[PDB]
């Protein structure tokens, strides 16, 4: 779950931020979306076809810009994405300008989801209610013997994970982020490999950037949305 519950005045403050973020987005769009220089730098720059996008391992906007409607939040719903209403933007030219439009629309859809969460936040626990997995609350830890034992063990040994393996993926902001974790049944993962979307995007750079000018390369790097801690883990 999460480590602590939300503090008392947070939903109200998130709502007040949300009431003005739309204008904040409109002004950026005023500077960029119709600017002819912005279009000169982005239109037909870093084009990727749909088939090549699939073959290269691209995901997220890098894929949705080429016309393919795929998004893990809709295709394989996780935590609460099935309970909220939002739309998915899909490009058609597979270029930097289509990807920019996709990201700007995703801003709006995130604002939508944040408002729905502010309206539908339910009562109850925020972590799983088994003290063999997550630590019990502190007033139990200092009063109840089982709670103290479980707290001691969780912070010194850790919980044991049943042996096995999984590849698990989510629609991270930069594309499909996955982990492949192998458990040997102990408290420490046997193997943990991170699948970073930026890794595959930078791999596809040589195919995408060929025949462009150097400033086009700068624009393509920017459109891939690279953070290098992701790239080299």
């Amino acid at each position: 779950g999460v480590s602590q519950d939300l503090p008392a005045g947070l939903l109200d403050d998130i709502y007040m931020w949300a009431t003005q973020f739309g204008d904040r987005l409109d002004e950026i769009e005023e500077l960029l979306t119709d600017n002819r220089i912005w279009k000169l730098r982005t239109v037909n720059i870093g084009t990727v076809t749909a088939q090549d996008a699939l073959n290269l391992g691209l995901s997220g906007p890098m894929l949705r810009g080429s016309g393919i409607p795929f998004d893990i939040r809709k295709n394989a719903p996780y935590d609460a994405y099935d309970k909220v209403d939002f739309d998915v933007p899909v490009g058609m030219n597979g270029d930097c300008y289509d990807r920019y439009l996709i990201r700007m629309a995703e801003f709006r859809q995130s604002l939508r989801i944040i408002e729905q969460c502010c309206n539908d936040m339910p009562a109850g626990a925020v972590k799983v209610e088994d003290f063999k997995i997550n630590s019990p609350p502190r007033n139990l830890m200092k009063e109840d013997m089982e709670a103290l034992i479980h707290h001691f063990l969780l912070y010194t040994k850790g919980y044991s994970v049943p042996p096995g393996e999984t590849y698990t993926a989510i629609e991270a902001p930069k594309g499909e982020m996955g982990v492949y974790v192998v458990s040997d049944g102990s408290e420490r993962p046997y193997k943990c490999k991170i699948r970073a979307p930026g890794f595959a995007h930078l791999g596809a750079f040589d195919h995408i950037a060929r025949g462009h000018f150097l400033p086009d390369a700068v624009a393509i790097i920017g459109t891939m949305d690279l953070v290098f801690g992701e790239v080299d883990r």
Binding site: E27, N35, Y155
Partner: protein
């Protein structure tokens, strides 16, 4: 019906094929209006106006260090070792902080005190190894090790950032009141 190599969800949605791009001759706007927009840079002027509107709005800047950005009771800053109201140390050397520490930043030594108490003889934090995650403070069964809200302790030498037990206890003594505000605000949530 029955699908072969496919399914209803892999069928194209209604309207997935895009409409044909329009040619120049099927344009609603006459060439003179388009040329006016082209030569007089209409959207560029709109962008300049949007930028100029900001010039008459309130800026966001604060005058640090005379003003300060927002800080919350949960904030993770420099470490301290706390006491009981009697003045006795709270740490009883359980070593749960040392075990949980993801950066192995804590080094602890203990034995029986001459009065029989279980107490530390050495408590070190390498602040240049620490990742300021707060796991030690969550793990402690007696609220002994804490993170204050203090961030202003930059040093001129690295040796000054190897905190021993005296330094950490002095930090607890120095910051106890702010620590009590933070605890009074966040203890129910832990």
């Amino acid at each position: 019906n029955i699908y072969a190599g496919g399914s209803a969800a892999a069928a194209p949605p209604a309207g997935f094929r895009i409409h044909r791009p329009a040619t120049w001759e099927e344009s609603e706007e006459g060439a003179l209006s388009k040329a006016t927009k082209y030569f007089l840079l209409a959207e560029m002027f709109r962008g300049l106006y949007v930028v100029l509107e900001q010039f008459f709005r309130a800026p966001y800047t604060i005058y640090y260090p005379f003003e300060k950005g927002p800080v919350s009771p949960r904030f993770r800053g420099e470490h301290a070792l706390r006491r009981y109201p009697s003045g006795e140390e709270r740490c009883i050397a359980c070593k749960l902080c040392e075990a949980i520490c993801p950066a192995l930043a804590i080094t602890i030594d203990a034995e029986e005190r001459i009065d029989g108490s279980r107490r530390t003889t050495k408590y070190d934090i390498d602040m240049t190894k620490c990742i300021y995650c707060g796991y030690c403070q969550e793990s402690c069964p007696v609220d002994a090790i804490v993170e204050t809200p203090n961030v202003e302790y930059a040093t001129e030498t690295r040796e000054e950032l190897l905190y021993n037990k005296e330094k950490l206890l002095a930090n607890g003594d120095k910051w106890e009141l702010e620590l009590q505000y933070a605890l009074d605000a966040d203890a129910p949530y832990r």
